[PDB]
Design a protein around this ligand. Structure first.
Ligand SMILES: [Cl-]
Ligand SMILES: [Cl-]
Ligand SMILES: [Cl-]
Ligand SMILES: [Cl-]
Ligand SMILES: [Cl-]
Ligand SMILES: [Cl-]
Ligand SMILES: [Cl-]
Ligand SMILES: [Cl-]
Ligand SMILES: [Cl-]
Ligand SMILES: [Cl-]
Lengths: 170, 170, 170, 170, 170
């Protein structure tokens, strides 16, 4: 506020909402990871994949929080809703759910960018472009590649396919 | 006996019984290992898995024997009964038998801990907690994870599954 | 007291008493050590053995004092009674006296652990198990081993035996 | 059996019996070792000597088991009889018992070699010569050397002698 | 002949015959190796396995030739018969043929050893034991292990099995 300049109340609010979305995505990935660590699921590669994503989404949230402070905005936290499932099914089910989650995060980033462009807030626009937009695109391409490979394998002989994917890709 | 302090005859006996159980488990794993080294079985990863467990159970027994002496108890050895099978079937059969064995060792440890708590023998209780209880829990989780993976694979195409498990997990 | 939680007045008092016992044991070992450094006794290995024990018991007391503060207890010091003997006789006399001392420390630890269990103070119980109970058991076994060796030698030819023990074991 | 060639049923059986003998010898040495670790015996060198022999006999058994599989024989395990004594007396008693044990193992090896020669099984004959016959001869010479030294010392002043042997030879 | 001592004409002849057998086995493995290098077979691991065996059998022959000269025997060479097949079928066909070949070499070694024992030629007997008998036993066990693994895989889905064996074992 002594520092705040060209930073709309609308962007400040939307940044707080995006923080909650990223933290919720982190929580979802935490749940996905520990599900694949269950003794009756036991796919270590899959567990590690989602646990790494939990960390990445938490880091995204922290970078948004840092930015909020840099611009003189005020962080406001809300409840983090529990993930949508207690059990996540097969690796394919999980990967499909993960792409859905990422596409919603990406649309939120795109919406925030559009708001920034409308508010003529180029720092916001740059911030998103530099740390979030390309990272999301890259992650969604990777998930799509994984989905294709999982699906190719899970004809057959689905158990064999899920094992091989976890062993040879993840 | 010049050193013996707070060490009941009941615990001393139960420690000797647990030594026999661990040595018997070592012997069982010795048999499992060499079975998987047979030219008509030939699963090296499986052989190495059980041979390593033979060594771990022998080391467990030696640590119990050391403790028995540290407390002024007297080691008493009994016959080691031969393992329950001469041939161990498939990798899954073997892993199922191994989890049964471990759960019996774990229950023996839990029983000994309960005896120690009842005799107010905190050194015994600590000893078990520090060297045995978490090791057993970790080993049983690993075996459960292996069982799940074996079972996933041994739909199909059981021969293919047993080969892949041995090559890619073990 | 701003920090104090689940820490009974009974345990706090017993911890202060155990500090005094450990400091007294340190003092006793200080006296034992310097006795064996006398020109008319002159058993350097024996002197070093007890001087090292003096240091270990002092360190035990300091760890109890640190814990007392960590839990929000208040250290209260009492007089340290002088050791029970001015002259300690033979190496065997000294080692017998040392095992008596250790067994009393061990019983004090066991008593404090029982108090902690009754007060449902698991931090205390863990603290004792981790730093004191196994250390005492190990030390008492060592002393017992030394006693046996001394006694074996001090048939004969007692002077020869006391010399050889000091030279070849200590 | 796809691999088995020039390997008689008689040799296969005798190899299984020799495995049991070696494992039993390992168990005996385990008992001897822990006896000398007792606080009322306390001869560390003696304990280490027998504990090392326990390991060597176990390794002998494992090499026989490996060979059995290499030749297409089938390992069959029997109960391991408990050692013949619960308490082993003096170092001399123990060493005398150890030479008795070794001479029985050596005679078993010699008997198996004679069977191999009669069955015209030169691989067996070589196997024994290369890993077992000279090792046994060397070990029996060492034990004989130790026996002589113990006996020389245990005139006197037996306690002094047992101490010095343990300190200066073992 | 200035050097020849205790070396029968019968052993000298049998050594020359064994040289021819080893060279023929080398030639067979040369053919097996290049068959698996064909563009319409294309199993590199299988090719390398047999090419390495070609080299080992050639080295065996050279060691027999060296020995023949050391004993004052005279090397006599015969035609090397072409291998029994121009095309070797599947990996399993090839491995079955290889075990047949090895068992014939092993029986030749055993026969030569029996001749040496009958002629009281212990140098020959030692020579065979040290460089040939255990090597053959080890190689036949390995081939048997490979055969079992191939057979396990070549249910299914034989093409998949042959590929996986070559990729993951060889
Ligand atoms: Cl991880
Ligand atoms: Cl930046
Ligand atoms: Cl191994
Ligand atoms: Cl420990
Ligand atoms: Cl000192
Ligand atoms: Cl601590
Ligand atoms: Cl040792
Ligand atoms: Cl060897
Ligand atoms: Cl090559
Ligand atoms: Cl040579």
């Amino acid at each position: 506020s002594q520092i705040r300049q060209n930073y709309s109340t609308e962007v400040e609010a939307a940044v707080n909402r995006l923080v909650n979305l990223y933290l919720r995505a982190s929580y979802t990935y935490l749940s996905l990871g520990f599900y694949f660590d269950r003794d009756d699921v036991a796919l270590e590669g899959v567990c590690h994949f989602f646990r790494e994503l939990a960390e990445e989404k938490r880091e995204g949230a922290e970078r948004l929080l840092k930015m909020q402070n840099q611009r003189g905005g005020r962080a406001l936290f809300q409840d983090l809703q529990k993930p949508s499932q207690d059990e996540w099914g097969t690796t394919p089910d999980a990967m499909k759910a993960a792409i859905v989650l990422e596409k919603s995060l990406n649309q939120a980033l795109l919406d925030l960018h559009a708001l920034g462009s409308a508010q003529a807030d180029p720092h916001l626009c740059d911030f998103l472009e530099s740390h979030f937009l390309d990272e999301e695109v890259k992650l969604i391409k990777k998930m799509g590649d994984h989905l294709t490979n999982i699906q190719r394998l899970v004809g057959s002989q689905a158990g064999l396919g899920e094992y091989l994917f976890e062993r040879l890709t993840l």
